[PDB]
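Re: your question from the hallway

Yes, I did run it. Sequences:
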Amino acid sequence: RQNLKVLLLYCAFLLVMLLAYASIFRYLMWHLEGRAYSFMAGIYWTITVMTTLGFGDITFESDAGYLFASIVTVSGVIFLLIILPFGFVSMFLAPWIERRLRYHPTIELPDDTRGHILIFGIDPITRTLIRKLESRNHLFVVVTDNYDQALHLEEQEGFKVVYGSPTDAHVLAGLRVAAARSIIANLSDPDNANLCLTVRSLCQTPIIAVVKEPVHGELLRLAGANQVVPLTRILGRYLGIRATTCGALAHILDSFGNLQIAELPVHGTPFAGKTIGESGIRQRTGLSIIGVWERGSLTTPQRETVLTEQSLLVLAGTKSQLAALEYLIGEAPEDELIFIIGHGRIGCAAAAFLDRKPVPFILIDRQESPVCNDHVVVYGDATVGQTLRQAGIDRASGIIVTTNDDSTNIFLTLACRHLHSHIRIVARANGEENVDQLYAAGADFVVSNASVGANILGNLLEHKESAFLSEGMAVFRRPLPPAMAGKTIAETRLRPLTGCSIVAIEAPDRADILISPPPETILAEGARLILIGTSEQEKTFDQTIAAR
Amino acid sequence: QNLKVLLLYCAFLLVMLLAYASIFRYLMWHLEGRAYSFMAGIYWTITVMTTLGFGDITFESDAGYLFASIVTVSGVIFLLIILPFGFVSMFLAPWIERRLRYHPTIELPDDTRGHILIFGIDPITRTLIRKLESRNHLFVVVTDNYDQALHLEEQEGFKVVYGSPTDAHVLAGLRVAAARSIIANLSDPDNANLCLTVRSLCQTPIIAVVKEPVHGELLRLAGANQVVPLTRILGRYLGIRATTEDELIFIIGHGRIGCAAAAFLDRKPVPFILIDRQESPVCNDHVVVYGDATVGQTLRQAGIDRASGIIVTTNDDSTNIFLTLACRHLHSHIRIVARANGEENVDQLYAAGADFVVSNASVGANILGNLLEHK
Amino acid sequence: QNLKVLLLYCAFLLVMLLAYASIFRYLMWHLEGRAYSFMAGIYWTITVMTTLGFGDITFESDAGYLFASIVTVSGVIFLLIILPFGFVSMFLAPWIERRLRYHPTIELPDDTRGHILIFGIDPITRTLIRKLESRNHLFVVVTDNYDQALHLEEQEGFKVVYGSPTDAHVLAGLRVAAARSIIANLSDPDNANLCLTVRSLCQTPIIAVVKEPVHGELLRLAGANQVVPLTRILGRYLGIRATTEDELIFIIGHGRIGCAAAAFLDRKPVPFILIDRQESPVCNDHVVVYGDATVGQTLRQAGIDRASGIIVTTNDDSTNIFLTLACRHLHSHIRIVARANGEENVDQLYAAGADFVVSNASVGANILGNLLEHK
Amino acid sequence: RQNLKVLLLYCAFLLVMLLAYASIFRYLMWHLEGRAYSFMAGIYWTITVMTTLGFGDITFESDAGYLFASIVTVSGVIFLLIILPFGFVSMFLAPWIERRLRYHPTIELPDDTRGHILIFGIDPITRTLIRKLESRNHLFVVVTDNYDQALHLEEQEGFKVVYGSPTDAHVLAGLRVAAARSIIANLSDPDNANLCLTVRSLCQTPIIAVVKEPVHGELLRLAGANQVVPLTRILGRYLGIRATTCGALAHILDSFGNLQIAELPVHGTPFAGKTIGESGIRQRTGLSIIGVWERGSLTTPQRETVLTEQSLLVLAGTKSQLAALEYLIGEAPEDELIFIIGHGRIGCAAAAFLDRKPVPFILIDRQESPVCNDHVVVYGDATVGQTLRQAGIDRASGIIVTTNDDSTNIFLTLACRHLHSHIRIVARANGEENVDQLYAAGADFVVSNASVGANILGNLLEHKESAFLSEGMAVFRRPLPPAMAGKTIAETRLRPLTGCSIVAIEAPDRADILISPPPETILAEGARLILIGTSEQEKTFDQTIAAR
Ligand SMILES: [Ca+2]
Ligand SMILES: [Ca+2]
Ligand SMILES: [Ca+2]
Ligand SMILES: [Ca+2]
Ligand SMILES: [K+]
Ligand SMILES: [K+]
Ligand SMILES: [K+]
Ligand SMILES: [K+]
Ligand SMILES: [K+]
Ligand SMILES: [K+]
Ligand SMILES: [Zn+2]
Ligand SMILES: [Zn+2]
Ligand SMILES: [Zn+2]
Ligand SMILES: [Zn+2]
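Structure:
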């Protein structure tokens, strides 16, 4: 842009210089020496002089003609010999060298820039959220106050990088935060607080803050943030659920008090190896298989679907419906004891989780946690010798390996699995490049940080048409009224009446479900509906069915 | 400088021109018997050196060949090598050489007078500069830190010099004698060194910002014309804002300021609690409640409930904000006074819930600024 | 690459030449009725583009003027801009661009086979390289450390790649499948990661240098074809050299080696004293006498007098030298075995008084080297 | 050198190309078209073609002539249009940019380099030894293994800088250590040991090692070093001598057992304010004023010389002669108590000194000395408040301020002198740029590290014709034999007879001395000689006087 324009702007000047001279010449030849020259001769002459070719076939004779020739000559040397080779070189050669040779840190965004997604605080999660959602070519812009880090992210991108204080309002003004589509506040909690209060001072643009300590959750909504994600606590959960010898029930959401969305690791459970229709999970409980999570993907349930031990079943149903699956697994193993190696915010979160549903564990680390005063820790280097065995890794029913270094995690998983082939080992993979290797070391399940993080933010980013809608709302299930047996969702006109929206229609006699049905969907008899609206829209719903 | 070297070389070139154009007209006459008009001589000489080469005006004698060969090369050496080099070197070097690698300015020009020497850059001084360059005073900051001279050179509005502020030779190059005023905002021992050294070269007025108020008379002693105990003052402004029985003021942060503020609330007896993480390396006369205020029930275990005032005094604004935000959530009616190092965060401490905010940079600049034009 | 782009552009230029020289001869004939020999066409075309401009062969019709104007510019664009650029860009860029700022090599060519991947550079491997490039094997070292890739790139004899040795995509670019052998000389957890990852891409032989000998079977388990417990071995070589009653051997230095050596002198019961400064982060089974050996009567308070042998095992050669020098001064007849990390200091440990010197780099290279060509 | 040669080598080729072409042309014109051209025409043509001037007055006509013209044309564009502008630019423009833009670290010395002085371990002392002895333009070469430090020393020099391991023998080989004049080993003691053992492996070049811990002195001579300087211990001495309220006697050398070279701070002594002849120091004791040290300079004593309080008197005489000056000062003040603020190697050395001649002191510091277990230290920050007064700085007779930071030293000296105007304050100046300011703060005397260091090394460097001669020798004084009353030193021919050398001849009845007398010096009656030879040369001396 700014360099190419300067180029052919200067070419327009040169062509003007040409056409001018070629005519001044034809004038002089006529008015000085009495020679009528064709126009092309004027061009041909002028070119020949400036370019310093100088054929000498067309020359002047009067001193006056000498002067104008001398002039045109120099004008060739100044503008075709100096500037034009300079400009061709300066606009082409400078970018390759000046910008690799020394950083020219981008400090501001263009005036017109809109629709971008501001990333504040780069790390494995966000870096993975970027590589994943640039598959829709969103304009991802990351920001850093760290000069040497802006260097790295500028040479390898994918995403434009800005260098500056994320709290300085003037900086945020140059980032056109008002015209932004969404802002990801992935800094420290006090910086996240500063960040939000500052953005709320310039605009109202949606801010998804990733909070470290879950207690600071309400404090960041308070700082302005539209949605808060306690990632460290969540990953701890996913670890504690994966470690419980027999796959246990995990509660995801309490939609008012009507419906519970939950999940279940199929491992060590009578549904493992068995299929969906074979297990007949919906039939015996009345539950709703809203989706199955196997190989890092969200898929719709099928009857012919075999549940691997590695699988995770999402659920939806009443409190007495979930209860029916805590008995269809369904007995706890005697002498449970889970080693949690690593007392980060995650290992601590996981230990807080295994506390919530009482399973005794041992927290092993090297130094004491700067954050936690409520967890007793066994102190000692796990890498060095008999440390795990002195704690008694022998009577353990599960090892959760939670170091912030993947290479170490691998080496423990490798060390444990060698030492005990049959025990449940759950590891944690910061960088998702090491996921495959924790499995290959012997991990029964691997929780990739980057992957789980990106998936949450990603979903919260493209659901951001109704994510703050979904926030502060209740989701419910309604047995489809027989009056609408055979009628379209569109023909029924449910949303203009009630305000609720259909997200899923399952079969009357099947574990199969149709999720996010199109407006042209013809309803069926007995088909069980599951919708999302306000608490009060679930309410006025029952009329607009009775009304019409 | 670089421009002078350019058109000095253009004067030489025009001399070369007028000379050659006349040597030519001489030769044509004295070698081959051709009288050429002066303009023809210029026109020829230009045509040769510029290597255009029309060939309408040529010599014939071997002698004429020689002078033509000479004028030809002189064109290639001075219009083909130097003049494109010089146009490129004076224009292209500054954009690249100076962004690409630092050429640290080590000295001030001979004639430089009326400048205001800044020694020890920080939020205060940086704010004193943006504020008093609205009268376009020549602000010159100095640092012994190479990597810091880099930052301040690319972003300016003030020229930056790299060198030891205590080395007398350095101060001599800074023309301290002809200076209008000197701001000594370093450590107390450095400030002392700085003054004793300037008093050795001149008598130029020196406004020293003293950290520990006891060292105040020691710096006037080092030469300083006026001494400003900024940390003590900001503590005062905090203690005054927090009172305005069962009075009880939490002071979160035991810096020199929170300690100054606690020393202030002592002077007019109001009971307070000093909360911090580590013990103050400077104070042995204030009892401190030790514990991280960010982590959980720390403030409540001290009893933030029967408190009539919280003074939030961390040296990090983002943390101050997050406390003010945390306190005001926890207690809507109590007087919360916060402190804003960088004045970019002032608005946000208010927005968090601060009943009053004391901006360091702002209060500092205002004092120095006033002391500078009242000088 | 860069050379190809050059004479590819020369082929285009010669095409431009032969084309123009014929278009010209055509025009002269079809425009003005002048038959020109082919060489005249070349000679003209050269003369125009090169901007020489003799003016002996010129057109007269406006049409001829146009084609001449065209050929003229085509000379200025392709002989005046690109050809001097390209000669400069392919020649001048490598000397400057690559010394001036690093362009870190991130990947290996498609066809690269028969190479020996080095993972984890240090005195041993660096010595294994200088020794086995006497058969001109393609040694490629890898590092995730940017500033270390710089050093190893300017001083080589081995190509350097910058990247995570555990990232599978990185290993894919290194053509690990077509590799001849891989040397895993990282930490034990990294070595484990490294192997499990290579075993995921290929089955290429991996010689892992294991630090703690207990992790030996764990690395064969990670895939490694052969495991070398170098630290344990060097300890052995030290313990053997120090015996060869009242036998009593001082082992100065409680590294993995001095600890290995002490474990060795345990296996065939000879009483010793382990002297160090801090406690070993790895060993809880060796009692150590704590105290700085450099500072005064430390060795004599332990009783270096009734000792039958000193094993000097510091990870600094200059210190080892200074101890060996200090001991041999203090006791001429006692058996002193020292350890030489860098083999540049071997001669000096002898010269200080070492009865035998165990060079780390040398013993390491010899083992790996043998394991590499016996492979 | 290497770049200029490549330039005019290429100019020789160009002129060859010229003279060749100009003759090929004249040949062709004759053998192709039948035109005899003068030689100058050939040059003139050839120039005109290659330079792309192209007058077109002299052209060919045959196709053959076209070819050779086309050839000469291109040869102009390749060698006058590409290389010659490149080479003019590359040899001129590269040094200014390539070398400022990125370091090209000098890794080796030229083959022929001899007579240089290798500096190993740059610091205030050596940097001052360099600025001082480049006033004789010696080739000072400093060496460092620190890349970022080689950068600094290369841009500011004065002295060429080499980058490499000073212990690596190959490195030392490139430094041509064999052809070296002298080597200064100013590294750590183990590095100094390594350095010497390595140099002794390549050559025998003289090595002056600056030893930190004085106990390691004999260990470095053992490593090869020809002379060892325990600088830290010496500076401690100079501090302890300066602090003793009344100027005390300090013993410099025990030449066998015959003669003692000593010194005396004149401060607080009855010679202060008084002159040399007025005090009549030589007269009452028999001592020899070998030189006076006032303002950082070594000067010959004069009778009309006033001894300031700041002065230091060097001495030479027997054990009973020095004794006579420990009573002419001469009484110790009651209640002596010296604060030594700073427990470095120097403050510790100074405290070890004030121990040797029992004066009670207080060692104050912040942390405990990693090196000393024999000095009890009062721990506490001296900058912070009542720390000095709680130790009782009130009953102190002297403060020695010995921090490794000058700005702090200044601030203490400034703080003490404020607190106590009359007490003896001795400070220490690392960098000699701060010396003036310690005085201006109130220091009664300032010991500049850099200055005292350079002066020792400097002297040891230019005395290196007889420094190792002076080492292991004894210096003596002899009452000039009356037989040589009126005879020259040269006429006497003392050195070929005895082997001793005259360094000083003083007057029979004067405190004045003539030092390093020229060979043409006519002796006098009673004039007292002081010479330097071997222990055994002082012996055989008494014959060669009795012989003739
Ligand atoms: Ca991996
Ligand atoms: Ca802000
Ligand atoms: Ca060596
Ligand atoms: Ca100074
Ligand atoms: K012509
Ligand atoms: K003609
Ligand atoms: K021409
Ligand atoms: K021409
Ligand atoms: K030309
Ligand atoms: K040109
Ligand atoms: Zn915890
Ligand atoms: Zn305090
Ligand atoms: Zn051990
Ligand atoms: Zn001591």
